[PDB]
Design a protein around this nucleic acid. Sequence first.
RNA 1: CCCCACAAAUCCCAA
Lengths: 20, 391, 56, 262, 66, 171, 115, 30, 49, 135, 147
Amino acid sequence: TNASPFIKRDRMRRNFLRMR
Amino acid sequence: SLHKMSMMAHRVKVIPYSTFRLNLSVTSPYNADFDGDEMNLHVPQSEETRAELSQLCAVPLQIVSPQSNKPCMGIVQDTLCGIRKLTLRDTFIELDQVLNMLYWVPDWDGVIPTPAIIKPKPLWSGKQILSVAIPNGIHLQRFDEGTTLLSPKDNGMLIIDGQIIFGVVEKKTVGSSNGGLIHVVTREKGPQVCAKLFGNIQKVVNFWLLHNGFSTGIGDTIADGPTMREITETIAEAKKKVLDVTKEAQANLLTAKHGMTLRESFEDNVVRFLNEARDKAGRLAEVNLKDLNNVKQMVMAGSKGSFINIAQMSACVGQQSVEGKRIAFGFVDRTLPHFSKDDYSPESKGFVENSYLRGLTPQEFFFHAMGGREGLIDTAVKTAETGYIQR
Amino acid sequence: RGNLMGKRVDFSARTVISGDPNLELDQVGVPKSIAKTLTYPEVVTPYNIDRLTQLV
Amino acid sequence: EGPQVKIREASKDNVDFILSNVDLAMANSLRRVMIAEIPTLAIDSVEVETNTTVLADEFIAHRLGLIPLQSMDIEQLEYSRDCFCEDHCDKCSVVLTLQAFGESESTTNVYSKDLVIVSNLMGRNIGHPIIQDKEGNGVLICKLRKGQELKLTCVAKKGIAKEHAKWGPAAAIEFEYDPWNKLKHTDYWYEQDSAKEWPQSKNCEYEDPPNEGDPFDYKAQADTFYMNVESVGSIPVDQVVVRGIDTLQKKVASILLALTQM
Amino acid sequence: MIVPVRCFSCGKVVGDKWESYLNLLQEDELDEGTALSRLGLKRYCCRRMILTHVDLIEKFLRYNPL
Amino acid sequence: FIVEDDESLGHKELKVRKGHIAKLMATEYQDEYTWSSLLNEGLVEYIDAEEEESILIAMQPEDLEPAAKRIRATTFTHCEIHPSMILGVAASIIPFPDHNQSPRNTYQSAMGKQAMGVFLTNYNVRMDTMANILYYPQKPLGTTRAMEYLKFRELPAGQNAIVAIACYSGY
Amino acid sequence: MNAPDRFELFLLGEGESKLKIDPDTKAPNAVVITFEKEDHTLGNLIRAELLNDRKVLFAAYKVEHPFFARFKLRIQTTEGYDPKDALKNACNSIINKLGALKTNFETEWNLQTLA
Amino acid sequence: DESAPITAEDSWAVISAFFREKGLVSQQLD
Amino acid sequence: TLSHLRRTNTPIGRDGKLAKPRQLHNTHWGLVCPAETPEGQACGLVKNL
Amino acid sequence: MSNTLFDDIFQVSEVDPGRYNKVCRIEAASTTQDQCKLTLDINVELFPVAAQDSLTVTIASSLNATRSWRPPQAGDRSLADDYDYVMYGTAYKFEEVSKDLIAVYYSFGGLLMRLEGNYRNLNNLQENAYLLIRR
Amino acid sequence: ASRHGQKGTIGITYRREDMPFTAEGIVPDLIINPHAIPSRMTVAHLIECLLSKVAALSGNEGDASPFTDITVEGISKLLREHGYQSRGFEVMYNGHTGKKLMAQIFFGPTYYQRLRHMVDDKIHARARGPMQVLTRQPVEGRSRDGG
RNA sequence: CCCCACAAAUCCCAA
Ligand SMILES: [Zn+2]
Ligand SMILES: [Zn+2]
């Protein structure tokens, strides 16, 4: 039951970059 | 400067590490915390001034406040909590500790009292050793609502010949109070022995706390599951009662209490119901609260805390207020643009439902801000006003 | 009001304060810098001659 | 013979062991002596001949005063204050120099291995800055680009940890006894259960469970302590332990001889 | 600014690993968690610093003074 | 956010959809939708302080749109983009401002401006009467999503420490 | 700043030894000892190991203030037995015990020499 | 899908765009 | 610095009244921060977007 | 110089924890005496006590302005110590109930005990005494 | 000061050798009075401490997000599975003796910031200094060495 | 030398 305790900027950057 | 105190003479022991340094006991009369306060000094020049300053403005002959005929002095937060911790029937202590803390008392008689118990090991009650710091020839009886001379609840306090007999030390007994111990010793023996008493008590209790240690945390606040569920249903039934009263009002039949207007009676009734809900919930949360809790210990021990504090942290806050009249309709027919118009439900018109533990909701947050702002501004004006009156 | 009933004075200081449970009521902790600066007059007696001489 | 010792495991940097037949005071005193006054060597005074970097000077001085140095033979020399000399003779000092040039077009780093010994080493293994990593680069000091210069002269002197953290070799210590709380020195705060609300120490498996309802052994006494010692790297760990024991016993002998003199 | 040396709380030397820590998050696309774990920081005192450090000399130096 | 009462999919829905936000993310990561480009086609609308007396607002984009932690009509016209945006600059720094008393938040909001750290980067060149710069600033472990937009994480204020809540008997 | 300085941590006092003697007038054979340039790291150990002896009556030590690296220690014992002899025997016990510990430690570590 | 609704989390992207466009001192500048 | 640009101020008086805009208002929702205010003789006067 | 003032055997009715983890109030009735009543505070953690148990009590004025308590003297201590619960304290109040039944209240550091019975209207004390309990 | 108005000053400073220390050997950076918690009634500070601890353990940086679904229970579960006491209480040792501390202590990382009021700027004393021209009284101002 | 800003300091409570 983490309920999103953390957020990462560079990981989201890379994930959406590979998504594009 | 406000009253005769905040003006006391002092002896000086010069210290490195440039700053001022003073005893915790005298904190309250100066009304000065350590949050970054600043403090003044004046040095006499002649001999007459020094003499009269020593004989009139010294602290030891300033213990009892003439303005309220009770001692303005008194031990404070840390040692108070600690001495409450020590003065419990369920505590004990070993040779190794007691030898040191006996040596800590400056005027210790150099005689060790016999252990209260011997069977496997000599031990001592906290009361037993603490009696040493008490000067001999003192007597005191309290008998507060329990105290059957064999006090099961251990409330009250009795001292014979400067030796504790039974009871738990409390701000109601050792703090600033009409029948306080400090009052008794000051009036009885001499208005400087009390200073040594302060020193001894502070020193020994601090030493014992050092090796005991005491703290608190989040787990202090969190409460039992089914109990907070009961809190929730109590809030719900209060809401149901409020809604029922509102329904009765909306059908034009009502008590219409003598004198005041229909709307006034409605507001009075709803406010009464909400306050009933809040304090009943707080009572339930408290009676839940475990006796091994730290914050409960702290609040019942005196110095800091309240029923209201734990209630607000654990169960509910209660509706914010703006000069009694609960939050009014800023916008037309509503208190906030997220609500339908013409609603009198407690949430619509600003009743804080949740508790600090879970955290508020945007609207409730705004209402809390309103209340805080009200308090801030009212004090920020009354200060200058009442200063003018005082002058 | 600014000069007669209330005025600047001399032999004074002000700093920040902190607590200490090792110091009894009538005492107060003072930084040695102040003791260097703040002073107090004494008159020479046949009693304090030695101490004052050493102090000088 | 007395306070027996059993070793758990060891590595280049840390040591774990068991300690038996000891009183609590002795173990705590050991902890404090390793953590407080083990003698070593560190940079103390710096001469900024010329700075050009964007970084401040005393900033750089403080950063320099923290790199560990090889200190196996520290006992050989003596304190500067106890030395009859003036201005840090070779018998009580070591001199270091740094030379950083902003030559390239990319940023250039400055590592501890850049600075070099200058004065006489007199044949004792002293003053070599430790390089822990496999890459031979000490801790980074500062960076330069194409226009900056640093000419630094440093003097390293004896010092001890307790007066300032520069000379701290330990930087990491651990302490345990009675993981099962059989001595009942402290209880456990708990909202619902004492057991579940707490985890189990890795030291639990060595001592037995509390026998599930045995009467409280009042006369039992603490022993069987659990030690973990990890050094910064300025000196081997067995060395720090033996040196701590040695300095403690030297202190005790000193007080005894002072008693005799009195 | 330069990554601190000799972790405040414990005292273990920090900063030598910093540049290693960077490339671990660049060509190895690990998380900071496993990055430090392989880097070998059991205690979190040595670890808070690596997490929260903010380089500024990178911004400073890329001026062109003289 | 503008909310269309009508919906072919059913009950009620705010006009914007997932495609638009996907395009926004794509535009951002390119390093061509702008906020203006959101404005033109009717997806968000400015509201002055006067209008609210004629608009109903939905706090959450899902609060009542379809048919323990904490406590949680059908004629909405606009939904708040995000509640945490009712703050200002300084209060945004406060972690979990909900979970503490409001005057204490006001005390912190006022006080934080009296904290050192960094104020620019050119300070080595920029003369001034007064200046404070600390050695090792640290971005706080706790944080909200907002101050990323405040560039705070880039230029932190203080550095976090390992605090202990205890009365260690003296001071 | 013109205060007593940081050298009071360990740099021994000037013109005076590491200790001073004073006999208490409140109990027979009671002696208080003033120690300076040290703190708990020595006083706790000394007091505990002295209390280990049973021929001694009472021992205790305290530090007057964390500012000053000085502490006092009070001892009295049964008649005849001089306290100073007791404490010197205590120091002998300490040195012997720690020496045994050391020697055992090197023996162990050399035994545990890898491979 | 592209016509799906928006989770409360997703709103942050809109905010990001809004700041990227407007800039904080927009009031004084404009 | 950022918290000094988006700043406001109104003239009311030297000392101040105690039933007029110092206290927050419902209309202030979502336009002016409900906590970022100075305290003392200006509380509720200076306010922040 | 050391003599017992009163001895008896008591049967405990029940034990009360009183939300205290280590101490518990106790109470018992005399066997040989049909009127002597007893209450007392006992450190159960230090010493197990069960309901429906026989107890033996002893006053023991002394042991065969006193000086400092001597360390346990690991050598011979040939005292009235062939019991378990040996402990010390002080009396503080006397009460005459039923015009015949005297009551004495003893304080033990923070612990308390109350004794009844009317035949030793003079044998019992003075302020302080000891207490001896076996098994 | 913290991020929750809990201002204050330093009283004294110890060093590690006698500062209280935990099982893992961590020693705290600074310690404040527990009594400062309830009266001011700032709770969010403690949540910040707990979340910061768990974030440092996981390495993943935490979140505040004033109005969200994050509650204490998830934090406690995650911290517990990382291998610590769920509510953050910790065994604690007394540096002077090494004995167990009878109670337990809540203990973790927290953000602070240094303020503008250093004592050296605010210390000031005067004895027979310059006089004011108009009124022969002592002059004003610490900078001008006033009274 | 004055005038204006700008900040601290009075940060509760009682049971
Ligand atoms: Zn030399
Ligand atoms: Zn570390």
